Write an enzyme that holds these catalytic residues in place. Structure first.
Site, PDB file in Angstrom:
ATOM      1  N   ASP A  76       0.841  -1.195   0.000  1.00  0.00           N
ATOM      2  CA  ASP A  76       0.000   0.000   0.000  1.00  0.00           C
ATOM      3  C   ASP A  76       0.879   1.250   0.000  1.00  0.00           C
ATOM      4  OD1 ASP A  76      -1.803   2.006   0.422  1.00  0.00           O
ATOM      5  OD2 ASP A  76      -2.859   0.984   2.070  1.00  0.00           O
ATOM      6  N   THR A  77       1.198   1.772  -1.188  1.00  0.00           N
ATOM      7  CA  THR A  77       2.066   2.943  -1.238  1.00  0.00           C
ATOM      8  C   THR A  77       1.386   4.189  -0.684  1.00  0.00           C
ATOM      9  OG1 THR A  77       1.430   3.403  -3.538  1.00  0.00           O
ATOM     10  CG2 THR A  77       3.401   2.033  -3.165  1.00  0.00           C
ATOM     11  N   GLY A  78       0.061   4.182  -0.543  1.00  0.00           N
ATOM     12  CA  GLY A  78      -0.641   5.296   0.062  1.00  0.00           C
ATOM     13  C   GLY A  78      -0.675   5.295   1.573  1.00  0.00           C
TER      14      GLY A  78
HETATM   15  C1  K2A Z   1      -8.487  -0.918   2.464  1.00  0.00           C
HETATM   16  C2  K2A Z   1      -7.055  -0.659   2.002  1.00  0.00           C
HETATM   17  C3  K2A Z   1      -6.643   0.803   2.194  1.00  0.00           C
HETATM   18  C4  K2A Z   1      -6.878   1.251   3.635  1.00  0.00           C
HETATM   19  C5  K2A Z   1      -7.455   1.665   1.234  1.00  0.00           C
HETATM   20  N1  K2A Z   1      -7.030   3.055   1.315  1.00  0.00           N
HETATM   21  C6  K2A Z   1      -5.870   3.484   0.559  1.00  0.00           C
HETATM   22  C7  K2A Z   1      -4.691   3.721   1.502  1.00  0.00           C
HETATM   23  O1  K2A Z   1      -3.521   3.865   0.750  1.00  0.00           O
HETATM   24  C8  K2A Z   1      -4.903   4.975   2.352  1.00  0.00           C
HETATM   25  C9  K2A Z   1      -4.853   6.253   1.520  1.00  0.00           C
HETATM   26  C10 K2A Z   1      -4.915   7.446   2.473  1.00  0.00           C
HETATM   27  C11 K2A Z   1      -3.658   8.252   2.766  1.00  0.00           C
HETATM   28  C12 K2A Z   1      -3.720   9.439   3.723  1.00  0.00           C
HETATM   29  C13 K2A Z   1      -5.039   9.815   4.390  1.00  0.00           C
HETATM   30  C14 K2A Z   1      -6.297   9.004   4.100  1.00  0.00           C
HETATM   31  C15 K2A Z   1      -6.233   7.818   3.142  1.00  0.00           C
HETATM   32  N2  K2A Z   1      -3.820   5.054   3.305  1.00  0.00           N
HETATM   33  C16 K2A Z   1      -4.007   4.776   4.704  1.00  0.00           C
HETATM   34  O2  K2A Z   1      -5.086   4.568   5.174  1.00  0.00           O
HETATM   35  O3  K2A Z   1      -2.820   4.764   5.445  1.00  0.00           O
HETATM   36  C17 K2A Z   1      -2.892   4.735   6.934  1.00  0.00           C
HETATM   37  C18 K2A Z   1      -2.044   3.958   7.337  1.00  0.00           C
HETATM   38  O4  K2A Z   1      -0.746   4.741   7.171  1.00  0.00           O
HETATM   39  C19 K2A Z   1      -1.160   6.163   7.446  1.00  0.00           C
HETATM   40  O5  K2A Z   1      -0.693   7.140   6.202  1.00  0.00           O
HETATM   41  C20 K2A Z   1      -1.755   7.532   5.579  1.00  0.00           C
HETATM   42  C21 K2A Z   1      -2.889   7.358   6.558  1.00  0.00           C
HETATM   43  C22 K2A Z   1      -2.409   6.179   7.503  1.00  0.00           C
HETATM   44  S1  K2A Z   1      -8.319   4.166   1.391  1.00  0.00           S
HETATM   45  O6  K2A Z   1      -7.857   5.551   1.349  1.00  0.00           O
HETATM   46  O7  K2A Z   1      -9.074   4.041   2.640  1.00  0.00           O
HETATM   47  C23 K2A Z   1      -9.382   3.839  -0.011  1.00  0.00           C
HETATM   48  C24 K2A Z   1      -9.018   4.409  -1.372  1.00  0.00           C
HETATM   49  C25 K2A Z   1      -9.931   4.114  -2.545  1.00  0.00           C
HETATM   50  C26 K2A Z   1     -11.183   3.277  -2.320  1.00  0.00           C
HETATM   51  C27 K2A Z   1     -12.090   2.976  -3.496  1.00  0.00           C
HETATM   52  O8  K2A Z   1     -11.487   1.927  -4.186  1.00  0.00           O
HETATM   53  C28 K2A Z   1     -11.530   2.708  -0.954  1.00  0.00           C
HETATM   54  C29 K2A Z   1     -10.621   2.998   0.221  1.00  0.00           C
END
Ligand code: K2A
EC number: 3.4.23.16
Lengths: 99, 99
Positions: B25-27
């Site tokens: 999960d690069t996000g």
């Molecule tokens: C279910 C798998 C992941 C949780 C999905 N997420 C993408 C994820 O990359 C999010 C994307 C993301 C990034 C920043 C803020 C909100 C969401 N990152 C995230 O939640 O990371 C958390 C853990 O490390 C911390 O750094 C970022 C927040 C913390 S998401 O944002 O919730 C998401 C994106 C797109 C859809 C539709 O397909 C549904 C859910």
């Protein structure tokens, strides 16, 4: 190019005649963008992650340019804290993970 | 390996001696796993996602092997919707984005 992950993989995108910063996010199935007033029809959708679900508007066949790479696909618009480029568009620009 | 993104980038991880499946999960800044038992001390922390904030247990300096590559870093445990491997560990296995 090659993007290391020491910092968030933020890149400039162009959508609806606007430039924005967005995450190249391999953990997102679909692309989610901050609230913006796009024209055209849309369908309601709810998407879930850490913390729960948010309500978004699903637009189809939206043109997006990511680092000069053009793509067209579904874009979800809603109260997300960050612009997220998901796999539906990452595949269209030839993006891969490598290690 | 080189991983394309037409499917979720799911890999097998080993943590605490147990095999699991997790999403590259690069996000995600941080690595968050579903509820599980891990040895050693932990501290209560909060993390925010697309839908809000959740309470997690923070385990530091945890050994974790990701698709055959070893890492040692912070692992958060809590009610995440799916096991996600974040940048704190993706950097350790030498993961980059390429397009
Ligand atoms: C279910 C798998 C992941 C949780 C999905 N997420 C993408 C994820 O990359 C999010 C994307 C993301 C990034 C920043 C803020 C909100 C969401 N990152 C995230 O939640 O990371 C958390 C853990 O490390 C911390 O750094 C970022 C927040 C913390 S998401 O944002 O919730 C998401 C994106 C797109 C859809 C539709 O397909 C549904 C859910």
């Amino acid at each position: 190019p090659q993007i290391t992950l020491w910092k968030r993989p933020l890149v400039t995108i162009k959508i609806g005649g606007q430039l924005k910063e967005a995450l190249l996010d391999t953990g997102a199935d679909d692309t989610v963008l901050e609230e913006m007033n796009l024209p055209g029809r849309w369908k309601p959708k709810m998407i879930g992650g850490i913390g729960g679900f948010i309500k978004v508007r699903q637009y189809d066949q939206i043109l997006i340019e990511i680092c000069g790479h053009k793509a067209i696909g579904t874009v979800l618009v809603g109260p997300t804290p960050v612009n997220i480029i998901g796999r539906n568009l990452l595949t269209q620009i030839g993006c891969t993970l490598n290690f």
